[PDB]
Design a protein around this ligand. Structure first.
Ligand SMILES: CCCCCCCC/C=C/CCCCCCCC(=O)O[C@@H](COC(=O)CCCCCCCCCCCCCCC)COP(=O)([O-])OCC[N+](C)(C)C
Ligand SMILES: CCCCCCCC/C=C/CCCCCCCC(=O)O[C@@H](COC(=O)CCCCCCCCCCCCCCC)COP(=O)([O-])OCC[N+](C)(C)C
Ligand SMILES: CCCCCCCC/C=C/CCCCCCCC(=O)O[C@@H](COC(=O)CCCCCCCCCCCCCCC)COP(=O)([O-])OCC[N+](C)(C)C
Ligand SMILES: CCCCCCCC/C=C\CCCCCCCC(=O)O[C@@H](COC(=O)CCCCCCCCCCCCCCC)COP(=O)([O-])OCC[N+](C)(C)C
Ligand SMILES: CCCCCCCC/C=C\CCCCCCCC(=O)O[C@@H](COC(=O)CCCCCCCCCCCCCCC)COP(=O)([O-])OCC[N+](C)(C)C
Ligand SMILES: CCCCCCCC/C=C\CCCCCCCC(=O)O[C@@H](COC(=O)CCCCCCCCCCCCCCC)COP(=O)([O-])OCC[N+](C)(C)C
Ligand SMILES: CCCCCCCC/C=C\CCCCCCCC(=O)O[C@@H](COC(=O)CCCCCCCCCCCCCCC)COP(=O)([O-])OCC[N+](C)(C)C
Ligand SMILES: CCCCCCCC/C=C\CCCCCCCC(=O)O[C@@H](COC(=O)CCCCCCCCCCCCCCC)COP(=O)([O-])OCC[N+](C)(C)C
Ligand SMILES: CCCCCCCC/C=C\CCCCCCCC(=O)O[C@@H](COC(=O)CCCCCCCCCCCCCCC)COP(=O)([O-])OCC[N+](C)(C)C
Ligand SMILES: CCCCCCCC/C=C\CCCCCCCC(=O)O[C@@H](COC(=O)CCCCCCCCCCCCCCC)COP(=O)([O-])OCC[N+](C)(C)C
Ligand SMILES: CCCCCCCC/C=C\CCCCCCCC(=O)O[C@@H](COC(=O)CCCCCCCCCCCCCCC)COP(=O)([O-])OCC[N+](C)(C)C
Ligand SMILES: CCCCCCCC/C=C\CCCCCCCC(=O)O[C@@H](COC(=O)CCCCCCCCCCCCCCC)COP(=O)([O-])OCC[N+](C)(C)C
Lengths: 1105, 168, 82, 41
């Protein structure tokens, strides 16, 4: 039946008839009134049962004999006469009301339903997730009433306490009592608002009026919400979400749940509270207006299986408030003022008519309650003690169970209540044995609760002695808490795509993940030789810089709020932020690449750009203090980060606001010059000094002091250590600015010669010009091979895919390959000697050169793209050409729309021919450029140049061409121009940042090239080869300076953090909504005082009364 | 996932029916371009028959998607379909083709010169103008792409609303 | 015109995908020269003798549950921001 | 002097002396009422 409720759980049927209150009366013949009102000790009529076996008494007489000795009549028991016979009330209520529906669920069941299946109904069947708190509400069972202040404050606190701990409120489920007032408070407070306070009412079935409506299988239970006061029995309060209804087998009887309700709570405080945490779910109990049984059940908690605290509030009603009285006037041991029982027994007889000897018993038991007042909690709502019932509720479960302060934190940690922990658990004079703090931190980190981590870090914890290898290895490999599906995929690939089905994660295999995420030739400290051994082998396992290893964790597991927090702590702030940007950015790519079950990449994209801006804002700060030191920060080896550099890391992430920041730019300019002081020299003096070397010794060079911030080579460092002449030439020819204008001049002289060769005739053998051309291209090629093999990546297949990912490197490959095809044909041809251009192998060779040369003119746009003013226009041209594809397809369609009808009308006797392919494109294309072929349009006109193709239909071709040019020349060309106009505006908006970012790869290229240009470069290769066969820039800082840099780090690391808060406090509209927050305490307190001012003035005249 | 079910999954996907009609339509224009550019003898060539077959069945295809439309009133199945630019153009392109075929085919061939019989010429010249309809129908295939379609929308709005500048 | 269309071009393209895609959900699987066989077979079928989301009741039920849950969460939200 | 948002942040400056002094008076109003019953004690 797929209805586990129907199957395992069951109802109760009165299957026997025992006349109750059988008092024969009106309407003289017996049977009629013996058939009118003969109730049973079950509670129903014999005619209201009928029950397929109780109908057998409607017809004859009550299911028994006649008189049927009254020694035997009394003997009902649901144990004896009641058959179970599955439930018929497992529907769902649709409580009608406000602009919503207050939907809720229910079930019928017996008072002896097992405590485990009722759990297997709440959690398994109803999907309801196990709580971290229960609020067992035990107050008034009649329609009690309260005043406005308590109506709001008590409401918020009870609600909020359930919000924080995801609690399960428990009531009777009946809107005569607590449930009415419990449920109400949820209504106004908007607890529903993107939120649920799980709320349950254990009621009995028989009473709830319109129970017969709820009868039936799974249905939208049309509970009618009639507030008709004729139905005393009850109206189910329409806010409680769930209604377990004890079908004990009685109707009109009461108290079917009193044990079950408790047993459910007993087997709610008997399961774990999030397995990382080991504790039973704590259970508070509250008291509203309340009766003499409501105080009685307080004695069923204080002296009960694991002691259940009590949160009697102050000011509610008769019970909840009176228990404050006996609390207040009586000592910690419940020591009464001896005239208490001589004047409280008036209070009982004042509040109740419970009696006198009865009342004596009440206070006596009520002190038997108050024998232990370390465990109850009077919420003094007047005088504002705990300032919401909440803080008293939660505190009440952290005091009176002889629990340890670790056992007190660990619960607060589970609840998301730091405020409870900092204010109560972290109280003056506390014990905290040895690793309690440490065990909480392994719990707080895996559970992703920064606010407790933050607190613990302030309250004695140190990450230095707490990051051991088993521990942090644990902290990686936990699916408890916010879990990443991506890391398990990342470990898959690096582990050959082979998982042991269990596969505990090591620190080692993670190191290969980072080396894949950071890319290039990064080497994590988890894959090194020393670490890899001591790991297997395993005091020394305390990780010299732990806050570096946790920042990796928080980012590999998408725990941003932990990452961003931990980043604040420790040192190497700017570096950690540029790694994080790289880690997230790569995972944000591998999501979009792997494209599996995984998702959530734009979330990672945002996380990278979050840390990216942090590194930029630290650069700003550090640069506004000392420009020179900031440059040194961009270039010191890190040594915890694979001996990399903060700049190098930011280029890997393509983090442009950092590379386009004026600090890097001023440094990029200083590496461009080398030891040349170009603020004093000029680029025309560099060109002159290349062509006239003696001017090299006339230029203004630099010292060591104004070169100390610049990353230098081993040589450029050393040659300055030990300003003579030979060192003045070494400074010039090794500067990147010189290697540019020395390759540029050779390249321009290359094109001048190569232009001369294609324009001047070729005899059999090459001329000196053509040999010098071939020499350039040959060595230029070797130069390009080297800068692939000597790239930065390590995998040759990735050294390759990056280099071929640039336009001008692809073009050079084609230009170099196409040249030697041409040389091979030009040179390997058998010369004719009657005419050069009769041998078609020689011609093909020459014609490849004359097209080859176009590649080499266009390579000059790459030299021009170096200039700040020209480069934006080279970017445009590429974006224009790349993205105009679809306009040009339309243009080619419009073209054939015209070219095919024209050729068909004008040339109607054409066999198939290759000319037909030319003649449908040729003239229509030159029209695009405004050539209308004026004397060819009308071919039958007297001034025609085509008088012979006059014939039938040819008069159609002017009309065709008139339409064509309007569409082509006016619409389509200016649509393309309109596109290009928007490209222009887009590029100019971004052109300067992109130019600044591309200076890096540019300048670093001309820091690695040889000092000789491509014809003479071969000597530099030779010398730089037989060196290696026989046998880059680093900021060299002495320890005295290396020290002060770290001092300049921390000082600027510091001043940044302080600043952000200070500006952020001020705000603009923040301040206005901080005002509005303050508009309440005024209005409340202008009503506080304004409430008393009427209380003041009544006094004054009463004192003069 | 057996074999016959793997073919049923492919040829019944909309992406396949697009790139299968698109390739036939492009092969249609390649042939129909070949027919107008190459001379016509008395009877059609295999190329021209394959052209006529396309256009004939292409028409029946358009009849069906009117009668098998979503509306119920035939007079509203009609006014909606003719409310699209390329369905109006196809109607003209289909009607104008068979006027041309009827003249091209129903003409009395001359045998001294094809282009002396003016009924044959009118037929050929309708085809050579008819073909413009079929190049322009390709803008509807291109309008499927996110990048090209905005430029087809422009051209229509440009042409529709430039009336008064062109009168001046 | 250019600037006007580009401001609205992406919404209109997205709206026109519907009639486009639904067209090529109803067409025959054979293209217009060979389509005649598809007409013939799809005619003598009718002479002799569209897309629906088929949900089993177990799933059809949970959809209505996904309705109301999201129907609910919407109404609560609007007020709270407002 | 007049300003536009200046005035709003001159208000916010004044939101404190009110809140302090609404707590000044509001501190005493509890000190007042305890008196009255203590004078009638
Ligand atoms: C990752 C790297 C990035 C950078 C890219 C770098 C890679 C660049 C890659 C470049 C590849 C270039 C390929 C050239 C192929 C030539 C084909 C050809 O047409 O041959 C012709 C000559 O063939 C001969 O062998 C005779 C000519 C002398 C050799 C000159 C070509 C080799 C130079 C190579 C220098 C390599 C340069 C690179 C050096 C490093 C064949 O025709 P024929 O014999 O004339 O015809 C005879 C007919 N007849 C008898 C009727 C007359
Ligand atoms: C605005 C200025 C225009 C005035 C407006 C009024 C329209 C005036 C039009 C009037 C139509 C009558 C003129 C043609 C009569 C035959 C004469 C002739 O020699 O024709 C020649 C061609 O042309 C033709 O054979 C037909 C041309 C029709 C074009 C008109 C289209 C509608 C114009 C808009 C309608 C207007 C209203 C709507 C506007 C919104 C014959 O051939 P051929 O080219 O010499 O050469 C071929 C070979 N041959 C030499 C061996 C023969
Ligand atoms: C809601 C719908 C949306 C979709 C739109 C769909 C609707 C599309 C509607 C299309 C309507 C097309 C109308 C064609 C009229 C031809 C007129 C003509 O010029 O005839 C000529 C031939 O006439 C003949 O009868 C002989 C040629 C054979 C018949 C070919 C045309 C019929 C094909 C129809 C296929 C219909 C296709 C549609 C099928 C579904 C008359 O001239 P002649 O005899 O050559 O001259 C003799 C002179 N001489 C003796 C001196 C030489
Ligand atoms: C690779 C590009 C780099 C930039 C440009 C480099 C070169 C710039 C330098 C000069 C450009 C011009 C070259 C000389 C042309 C000589 C002309 C000739 O054929 O014979 C002549 C003399 O010839 C000699 O005296 C032979 C010279 C030996 C080779 C010199 C190589 C030096 C450059 C090695 C490279 C390293 C240096 C650069 C390092 C940065 C006589 O003249 P002609 O014949 O009556 O006149 C020619 C006209 N004709 C064709 C119609 C007949
Ligand atoms: C002797 C003379 C005889 C020989 C003459 C030979 C003729 C000359 C032949 C060719 C021109 C010479 C240069 C090659 C073209 C540039 C490649 C390119 O775009 O690279 C770039 C992208 O790369 C890609 O996107 C890869 C796929 C290519 C894209 C499609 C266009 C090019 C294909 C061929 C179409 C034309 C057919 C030509 C091919 C047969 C890498 O550069 P980037 O800086 O990263 O910018 C890219 C940015 N983007 C990816 C976002 C867009
Ligand atoms: C990637 C590498 C690609 C290319 C590799 C190498 C390919 C090797 C290619 C060619 C080598 C073949 C040598 C000759 C073969 C026999 C023919 C012969 O000798 O003569 C014939 C030559 O006929 C021709 O067509 C010559 C031109 C062919 C080359 C076309 C360009 C290819 C490169 C494209 C650029 C690629 C750029 C790619 C860049 C990435 C005729 O000449 P004849 O004998 O004087 O005439 C006799 C007849 N007569 C009596 C009427 C006069
Ligand atoms: C034989 C004729 C050859 C000359 C051509 C004459 C025509 C006019 C030519 C060129 C004007 C540009 C030259 C002066 C630029 C100096 C400043 C500059 O822009 O610096 C840039 C570098 O320099 C470049 O990027 C310039 C590129 C040089 C190659 C030119 C090839 C194209 C011209 C070939 C002819 C093709 C057209 C057809 C005409 C025949 C920026 O670098 P930087 O490190 O920032 O610079 C210093 C630091 N600072 C600027 C920050 C302070
Ligand atoms: C002899 C004849 C005369 C010679 C002409 C003169 C030589 C030609 C002149 C200029 C050549 C192009 C300059 C490149 C500038 C750099 C661009 C670049 O780096 O990336 C661009 C791609 O790059 C491309 O798309 C390359 C262009 C394709 C090949 C050019 C064909 C030219 C003819 C075709 C026209 C004919 C069609 C109709 C003809 C019937 C970037 O594009 P993006 O993706 O939008 O941006 C990403 C940014 N990124 C750079 C960071 C990656
Ligand atoms: C409807 C459009 C759809 C797309 C394209 C479809 C067709 C693409 C297929 C091919 C394109 C070319 C067509 C054949 C041309 C033959 C040439 C000829 O006249 O005789 C020849 C052989 O001819 C035969 O053997 C007759 C073939 C019978 C008809 C075949 C129909 C198949 C397509 C049915 C449709 C369903 C398939 C597609 C389903 C998606 C010999 O050649 P020739 O005569 O020496 O040279 C001709 C040039 N001339 C005129 C100058 C002489
Ligand atoms: C073999 C060759 C020989 C024969 C050659 C024959 C020549 C070729 C003849 C014509 C071109 C072929 C296609 C027809 C034109 C498109 C119609 C149209 O605009 O439809 C659209 C509107 O429809 C209307 O608005 C209805 C009234 C027409 C508006 C005025 C312009 C067209 C009139 C005729 C003027 C030209 C005179 C030509 C007519 C005699 C429906 O499409 P839509 O997607 O809803 O877009 C509309 C949006 N709008 C309404 C807001 C704007
Ligand atoms: C909606 C339906 C519209 C059309 C329906 C069908 C209309 C039926 C139309 C024509 C059928 C008429 C058949 C021939 C009649 C007698 C004349 C004759 O035989 O020869 C004459 C033909 O003279 C011409 O002008 C022929 C061309 C007329 C058609 C013009 C296009 C109409 C369609 C527009 C497109 C519509 C697109 C609309 C799409 C929505 C002369 O030729 P000859 O005999 O060789 O010469 C003898 C003289 N000689 C000795 C000097 C050589
Ligand atoms: C052989 C000759 C060469 C062939 C040329 C190439 C073929 C021709 C090329 C392009 C053709 C048009 C592309 C249509 C694109 C779709 C547009 C569309 O759907 O609706 C548009 C209407 O549509 C029109 O107005 C249609 C254009 C009128 C007919 C074209 C005449 C061309 C010549 C005239 C010039 C000559 C004048 C002067 C001459 C002396 C929408 O317009 P809207 O109301 O603003 O927008 C509503 C939006 N809606 C779509 C949702 C409804």
């Amino acid at each position: 039946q797929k209805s586990w409720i129907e199957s395992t759980l069951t109802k109760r049927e009165c299957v026997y008839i025992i006349p109750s209150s059988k008092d024969p009366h009106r309407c003289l013949p017996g049977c009629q009134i013996c058939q009118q009102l003969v109730r049973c000790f079950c509670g129903r009529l014999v005619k209201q049962h009928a029950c397929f076996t109780a109908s057998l008494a409607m017809k004859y007489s009550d299911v028994k004999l006649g008189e049927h000795f009254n020694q035997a009549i009394e003997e009902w028991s649901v144990e004896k006469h009641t058959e179970q016979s599955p439930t018929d009330a497992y529907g769902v209520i649709n409580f009608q009301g406000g602009s919503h529906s207050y939907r809720a669920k229910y079930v019928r069941l017996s008072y002896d339903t097992k405590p485990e299946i009722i759990l297997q109904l709440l959690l398994k069947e109803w999907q309801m997730e196990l709580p971290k708190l229960v609020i067992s509400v035990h107050g008034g069972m009649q329609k009690f009433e309260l005043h406005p202040r308590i109506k709001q404050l008590l409401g918020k606190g009870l609600i909020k306490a359930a919000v924080t701990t995801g609690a399960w409120i428990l009531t009777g489920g009946v809107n005569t009592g607590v449930a009415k007032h419990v449920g109400d408070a949820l209504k106004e407070h908007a607890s529903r608002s993107s939120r649920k306070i799980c709320t349950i009412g254990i009621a009995p079935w028989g009473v709830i009026e319109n129970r017969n409506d709820l009868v039936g299988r799974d249905v939208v239970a049309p509970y009618q919400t009639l507030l008709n006061p004729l139905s005393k029995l009850n109206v189910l309060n329409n806010l409680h979400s769930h209604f377990i209804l004890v079908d004990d087998g009685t109707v009109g009887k009461y108290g079917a749940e009193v044990r079950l309700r408790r047993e459910l709570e007993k087997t709610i405080n008997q399961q774990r509270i999030h397995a990382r945490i080991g504790q039973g779910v704590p259970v508070v109990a509250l008291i509203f207006e309340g009766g003499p049984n409501v105080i009685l059940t307080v004695l069923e908690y204080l002296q009960e299986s694991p002691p259940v605290p009590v949160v009697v509030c102050e000011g509610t009603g008769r019970a909840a408030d009176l228990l404050a009285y006996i609390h207040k006037q009586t000592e910690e041991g419940g020591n009464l003022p001896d005239a208490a029982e001589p004047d409280i027994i008036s209070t009982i007889k004042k509040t109740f008519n419970f009696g006198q000897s009865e009342a004596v018993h009440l206070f006596q038991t009520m002190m038997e309650c108050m024998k232990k007042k370390e465990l109850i909690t009077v919420f003094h709502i007047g005088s504002e003690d705990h300032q919401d019932i909440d803080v008293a509720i939660l505190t009440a479960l952290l005091k009176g169970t002889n629990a340890s302060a670790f056992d007190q934190l660990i619960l607060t940690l589970a609840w998301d209540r730091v405020d409870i922990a900092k204010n109560h658990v972290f109280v003056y004079g506390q014990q905290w044995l040895v690793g309690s703090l440490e065990q909480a931190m392994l719990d707080a980190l895996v559970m992703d609760r920064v606010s407790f981590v933050k607190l613990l870090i302030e309250n004695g914890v140190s990450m230095h002695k707490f990051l051991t290898i088993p521990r942090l290895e644990e902290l990686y490999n936990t699916k408890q808490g916010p879990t990443n599906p991506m890391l398990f995929h990342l470990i898959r690939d690096v582990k050959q795509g082979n998982l042991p089905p269990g596969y505990k994660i090591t620190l080692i295999d993670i190191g290969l993940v980072i080396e894949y995420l950071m890319g290039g030739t990064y080497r994590c400290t988890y894959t090194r030789k020393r670490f890899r051994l001591i790991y297997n082998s395993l005091e020394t396992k305390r990780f010299p810089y732990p806050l570096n290893e946790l920042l990796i964790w928080a980012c590999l597991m998408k725990r941003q709020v932990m990452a961003r927090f931990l980043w604040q702590h420790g040192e190497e702030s700017m570096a950690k932020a540029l790694v994080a940007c790289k880690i997230y950015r790569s995972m944000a790519y591998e999501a979009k690449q792997s494209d599996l079950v995984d998702d959530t990449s734009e979330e990672l994209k945002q996380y990278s750009n979050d840390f990216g801006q942090l590194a930029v804002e630290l650069l700003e700060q550090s640069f506004r203090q000392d420009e020179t030191m900031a440059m040194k920060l961009l270039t010191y080896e890190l040594k915890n980060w694979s001996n990399s550099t903060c700049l190098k890391l930011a280029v890997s992430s393509r983090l442009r606001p950092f590379v386009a920041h004026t600090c890097t730019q001023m440094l990029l300019s200083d590496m461009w010059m080398g030891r040349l002081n170009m603020r004093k020299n000029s680029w025309y003096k560099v060109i002159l000094s290349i062509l006239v070397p003696p001017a090299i010794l006339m230029l203004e060079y630099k010292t060591k002091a104004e070169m100390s911030h610049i990353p230098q080579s081993q040589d450029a460092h050393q040659m300055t250590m030990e300003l003579p002449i030979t060192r003045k030439f070494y400074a010039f020819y090794h500067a990147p600015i010189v290697k540019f204008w020395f390759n540029t001049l050779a390249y321009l002289g290359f094109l001048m010669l190569y232009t001369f060769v294609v324009l001047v005739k070729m005899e059999q053998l090459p001329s000196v010009q053509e040999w010098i051309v071939i020499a350039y291209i040959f060595t230029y090629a070797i130069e390009k091979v080297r800068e692939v093999f000597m790239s930065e990546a390590g995998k040759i297949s990735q050294k390759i895919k990056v280099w071929f990912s640039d336009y001008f490197n692809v073009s050079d490959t084609i230009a170099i390959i196409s040249f030697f095809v041409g040389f091979g044909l030009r040179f390997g041809a058998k010369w004719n000697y009657i005419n050069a251009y009769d041998n078609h192998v020689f011609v093909a060779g020459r014609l490849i050169y004359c097209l080859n040369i176009i590649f080499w003119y266009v390579r000059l746009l790459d030299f021009l793209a170096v200039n700040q003013q020209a480069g934006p226009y080279v970017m445009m041209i590429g974006k224009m050409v790349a993205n105009m594809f679809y306009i040009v397809v339309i243009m080619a369609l419009v073209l054939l729309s015209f070219g095919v009808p024209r050729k068909a009308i004008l040339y109607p006797h054409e066999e198939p021919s290759w000319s037909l392919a030319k003649d449908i494109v040729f003239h229509p294309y030159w029209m695009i450029f405004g050539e209308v072929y004026a004397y060819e349009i009308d071919v039958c006109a007297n001034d025609s140049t085509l008088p012979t193709i006059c014939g039938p239909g040819t008069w159609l071709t002017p009309f065709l061409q008139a339409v064509y040019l309007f569409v082509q020349y006016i619409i389509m060309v200016n649509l393309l121009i309109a596109f290009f106009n928007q490209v222009y505006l887009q590029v100019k908006a971004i052109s300067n940042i992109v130019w600044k970012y591309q200076r890096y790869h540019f300048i670093m290229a001309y820091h690695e090239k040889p000092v000789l240009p491509p014809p003479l470069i071969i000597l530099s290769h030779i010398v730089s080869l037989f060196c290696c066969v026989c046998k880059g820039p680093k900021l060299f800082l002495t320890e005295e300076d290396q020290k002060k840099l770290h001092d300049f780090e921390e000082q600027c690391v510091e001043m940044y953090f302080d600043e952000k808060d200070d500006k952020f406090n001020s705000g603009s509209e923040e301040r206005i909504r901080v005002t509005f927050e303050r508009v309440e305490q005024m209005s409340i307190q202008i009503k506080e005082v304004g409430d008393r001012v009427n209380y003041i003035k009544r006094s004054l005249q009463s004192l003069d009364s």
